């Protein structure tokens, strides 16, 4: 048995490498490095923070105050929020408008404050990739990001620019182009409690910036498709996911190194695993992330998977195969064009062309026990991760959001044992990158806010 001989010889090999618990167990170099550890400074940014907010089953779920404030902007795309240590929120749309909200009036719907709308006036007079230093967006703003301190919001989209606006007036303070032709930005994330931005640009590139210095730190390379989502916490690590290469990478940005995590679910072995006694299959494209803590994260796929990954395992720890359902099959009055229902039913091939909803938004509350998933099934899902950190489980649903969920994130309130949050979710009737979405089933372009309690 050749793989048995491989495992056996590898075991003998590791035993021989060990060859080349007592009462005294102290090692001189380890305790010397621990003396240097006692000598050093800056136990602030580099907390390898584990899950210290265990509250998944604690708070209420089923009776949230859900207000779906519809807004008149075609296809809202992103949502950025802010809390100091009054709270503002930000939305941005495919109609080239950024909009500031106040959200701190917690028991009611948010309040519009200020527009900032680019348009055809901001097309540059050059068509030349480094004099892209205009003051507004002329194409398809895809992402906003508020500063952790709140001086600025920074936004960008398919016009390959980063425009950083002031908070108090929504004015463009600085323009930083991405200096090449395909340099469309797709996701932005500040590292927490900082002034450092991580943008993920479709050149298979990740750009980093210091916003209050108007400088770019480091460009870091290495995905294989467009870097569709990004996520960061207080550590200088980052977690990006490229779309169709089906890998999620995490980046030690000062070292400029990474850990890659591929997928790897196969319907052959999965249907055999069920065949030991079923509509589930392989993977299209890993789409969204959120780093839950500094040892784990969660990925949202294109076949409706939500997966939970550790920092110490290439293959994922936990899967959840169907997370928002399978799409309604196309009707017999809109598949075939024959006359009889028998042939128009034969043109469905049974179950072979039922496609699942793909999770287009995922948000893990940082270091907490609970994350929120959203797609165009109409109902957001709330999941909590078990305390042994090897599984998660569906708590409840938030069914007042008709449309695609282009963004989810939460806003905190309450103290250490009694808490209430408003879950913002940007709702559109069209995916945040291309159109591709038919059967617009009662959708509206709005902000689904929910107020969850206890």
């Amino acid at each position: 048995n050749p793989a048995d001989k491989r495992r056996r010889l590898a075991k003998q090999y590791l035993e021989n490498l060990k060859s080349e618990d007592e009462y005294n167990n102290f090692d001189a170099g380890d305790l010397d490095k621990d003396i240097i550890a006692s000598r050093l400074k800056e136990d602030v940014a580099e907390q390898q923070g584990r899950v210290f907010r265990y509250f998944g089953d604690k708070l209420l779920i089923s009776e949230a105050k859900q207000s779906f404030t519809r807004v008149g902007e075609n296809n809202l795309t992103c949502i950025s929020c802010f809390q100091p240590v009054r709270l503002f929120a930000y939305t941005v749309s495919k109609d080239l408008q950024l909009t500031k909200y106040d959200i701190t009036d917690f028991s009611k719907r948010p309040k519009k404050l200020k527009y900032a709308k680019g348009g055809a006036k901001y097309i540059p007079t050059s068509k030349h990739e480094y004099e892209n230093t205009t003051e507004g967006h002329y194409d398809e703003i895809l992402t906003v990001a508020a500063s952790p301190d709140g001086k600025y919001v920074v936004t960008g989209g398919r016009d390959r620019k980063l425009i950083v606006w002031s908070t108090e007036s929504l004015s463009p303070v600085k323009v930083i182009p991405t200096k090449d032709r395909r340099g469309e930005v797709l996701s932005l994330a500040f590292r927490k409690n900082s002034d450092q931005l991580y943008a993920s640009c479709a050149d298979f590139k990740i750009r980093t910036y210091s916003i209050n210095q108007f400088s770019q730190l480091e460009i870091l390379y290495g995905h294989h498709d467009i870097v569709e989502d990004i996520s960061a916490l207080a550590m200088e690590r980052c977690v990006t996911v490229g779309a169709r290469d089906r890998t999620a990478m995490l980046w030690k940005i000062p070292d400029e190194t990474r850990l890659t995590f591929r997928g790897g679910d196969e319907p052959q072995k999965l249907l055999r695993r069920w065949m030991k006694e079923p509509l589930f299959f392989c993977e299209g494209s890993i789409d969204v992330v959120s780093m839950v803590d500094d040892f784990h994260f969660i990925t949202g796929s294109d076949n409706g998977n939500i997966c939970l990954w550790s920092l110490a395992k290439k293959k994922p720890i936990f899967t959840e195969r169907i997370a928002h359902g399978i799409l309604p099959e196309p009707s017999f009055n809109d598949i075939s064009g024959e006359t009889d229902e028998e042939l128009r039913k034969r043109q469905l091939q049974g179950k072979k062309l039922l496609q699942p909803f793909w999770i287009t938004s995922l948000y893990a509350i940082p270091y907490s026990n609970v994350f929120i998933s959203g797609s165009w099934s109409g109902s957001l899902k709330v999941w909590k991760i078990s305390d042994n950190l090897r599984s998660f489980e569906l708590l409840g649903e938030l069914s007042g959001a008709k449309g695609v969920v282009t963004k989810i994130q939460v806003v905190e309130s309450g103290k250490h044992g009694k808490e209430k949050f408003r879950i913002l979710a940007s709702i559109a009737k069209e995916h945040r990158l291309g159109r591709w979405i038919a059967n617009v089933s009662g959708a509206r372009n709005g902000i689904y806010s929910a107020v969850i309690d206890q």
Partner: protein
């Protein structure tokens, strides 16, 4: 615009000193510009501009980053005590020439 990153900041009370490694970041600039770097370091830390010092600069291939070794003092007098004389000739105030014979 140059950019600054301190890492692994330890304190040496025996030498009355605080030392660290300096990732200096200059996209589309030539290099570190060490006096301007001492200015930027002396303003990100406290004042002591004749007590902040950097010596070990290595720029990686293609530019952009350079790793240096940063040590910052309190008390410019004890910085003059503890720093070596060639770095004092390079940056600060000392100048004693060697007698040229044989």
């Amino acid at each position: 615009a140059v950019t600054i990153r301190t890492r692994k900041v330890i304190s040496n009370p025996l030498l009355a000193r605080k030392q660290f490694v300096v990732d200096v970041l200059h996209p589309n600039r030539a290099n570190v510009s060490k006096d301007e770097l001492r200015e930027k370091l002396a303003e990100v830390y406290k004042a002591e501009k004749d007590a902040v010092s950097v010596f070990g600069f290595r720029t990686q291939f293609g530019g952009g980053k350079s790793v240096g070794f940063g040590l910052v003092y309190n008390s410019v007098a004890e910085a003059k005590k503890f720093e070596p004389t060639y770095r004092l000739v390079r940056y600060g105030l000392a100048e004693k020439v060697e007698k040229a014979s044989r």
